[PDB]
Amino acid sequence: SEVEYRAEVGQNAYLPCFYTPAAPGNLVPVCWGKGACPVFECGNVVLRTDERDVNYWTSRYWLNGDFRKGDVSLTIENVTLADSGIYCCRIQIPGIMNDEKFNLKLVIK
Ligand SMILES: Cc1nc2c3cc(-c4ccc(NS(C)(=O)=O)cc4C)c(Cl)cc3[nH]c(=O)n2n1
Ligand SMILES: [Ca+2]
Incomplete structure (x- = not known):
């Protein structure tokens, strides 16, 4: 099919x-x-960081990797079927029209 996370x-x-x-x-x-x-x-924002630290989070959503070295992978704890969907991870590179946009498909069953 196509890349997905399960x-x-x-x-x-x-x-x-x-x-x-x-x-x-x-x-x-x-x-x-x-x-x-x-x-x-x-x-629909669930988590944000800035140049310093995590500045926003929603219950169940985590950055448990080494985000200070660029691992900004997401953990969603205790998933339900409502958590299926596309998620956006946007790297907000300083400057204009240069962000990196990743769309991650999560399938729960
Ligand atoms: C009571 C609770 N707390 C969190 C929480 C906290 C964080 C968080 C915030 C700052 C840092 N930065 S630090 C001090 O340098 O390690 C590191 C992390 C992992 C994140 Cl990302 C996600 C969280 N998600 C969540 O559901 N809850 N619930
Ligand atoms: Ca930018």
């Missing part, structure tokens, strides 16, 4: 997203949301 109800879901910081400690803000990246900034 989980059963009650498991954690794992959606990958990565960037390479220009130099260590120099982080780029990231936008995670539910819905494809053409929607608003990154869909």
Whole structure:
């Protein structure tokens, strides 16, 4: 079919997203949301970081990887069937018309 990420109800879901910081400690803000990246900034926002730290999160949504090294992969805890969908991870590279947009398809059964 096409790239997808899978989980059963009650498991954690794992959606990958990565960037390479220009130099260590120099982080780029990231936008995670539910819905494809053409929607608003990154869909219906679930989690955000800035140059310093996580600045916004929704219950059950986590960055448990080394986000200070560019691993901004998402964990969704205790998934239900309502969690299926496209998710947008947007790397907000400083500057205009240069963001990286990743659309991740999650299928729960
Ligand atoms: C009570 C609760 N807390 C969180 C939470 C917290 C975080 C978070 C916030 C700052 C940092 N930065 S730090 C201090 O340098 O490690 C690191 C993380 C992982 C995230 Cl991403 C997601 C979260 N999701 C969530 O459902 N809950 N619930
Ligand atoms: Ca940009």
